[PDB]
Structure 1
Amino acid sequence: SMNPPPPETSNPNKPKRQTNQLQYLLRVVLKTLWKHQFAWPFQQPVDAVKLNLPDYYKIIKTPMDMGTIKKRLENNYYWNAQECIQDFNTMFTNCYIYNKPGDDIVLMAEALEKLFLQKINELPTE
């Protein structure tokens, strides 16, 4: 099958705002995770046709990735920081759902999630 379209990253019908948490999520959290040595499988929607995974989008019905998260932050798609944090968590749990414990790819996601959780445990007050 064909890849599904990526998640929505822009919406003019939503209000926009900037906070000390949302800039931190893009400037500190997204950037640090992007530059991590294990980040490359998570920097764009899973290309199920390139990777020959015809089951991925039958199994993963809420896709999410760091490329989409970066765009959502850049377009002020999120009103609250929790929305962005939820998208990161959806990304990691997608990897765990599609794979099995102890797969190499899962070890990759777990390292990124550990770093993510460390950086969220230091999120600034509004």
Structure 2
Amino acid sequence: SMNPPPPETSNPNKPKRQTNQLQYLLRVVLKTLWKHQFAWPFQQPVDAVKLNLPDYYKIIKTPMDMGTIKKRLENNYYWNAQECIQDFNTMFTNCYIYNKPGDDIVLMAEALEKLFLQKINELPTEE
């Protein structure tokens, strides 16, 4: 019934590094998706209490959102760009699992996902 704590976005024990790929993920990928018209339901953790979804955290065991993804990227929480890419996939996949095809929320996740897959095709080469 209650919401779980938000996903961890900061750990001082984790090593930090900056890469051209992680910078692209926040400056290009995150910035493009955030401003999109369908982004609003994905900009923060699913609030199962305020949205009245009592079974959400019974179906979804790996919650994810762009707010958490952006906080992780600002805190230097990701070491590999693939960790961030998996997080975006998990957010899209959670939406498709909890909801049904043809739903307005699924059509919004599908458009964000198409915008995301185009950006990852142009992900610069490691340095």
Q: With structure 1 as the length reference, what TM-score do the two structures score?
A: 0.99
| 1:38-96 deviation per Cα after TM superposition (whole angstroms, max 9, x unaligned) | 00000000011011000000000000000000000000000000000000000000000
Counterparts of 2:102 and 2:87, CA distance in 1: 23
Counterparts of 2:67 and 2:45, CA distance in 1: 7
User: How many angstroms does 1:2 deviate by?
Assistant: 1.5
| 1:83-117 deviation per Cα after TM superposition (whole angstroms, max 9, x unaligned) | 00000000000000000111111000000000000
For structure 2, the residue ranges without an aligned partner over 5 or more in a row are none
User: How many angstroms does 1:4 deviate by?
Assistant: 0.7
Runs of 4+ in 1 over 4 A off after TM superposition: none
- The RMSD of aligned alpha carbons is 0.5
Counterparts of 1:86 and 1:47, CA distance in 2: 21
Aligned length: 126
Q: With structure 2 as the length reference, what TM-score do the two structures score?
A: 0.98
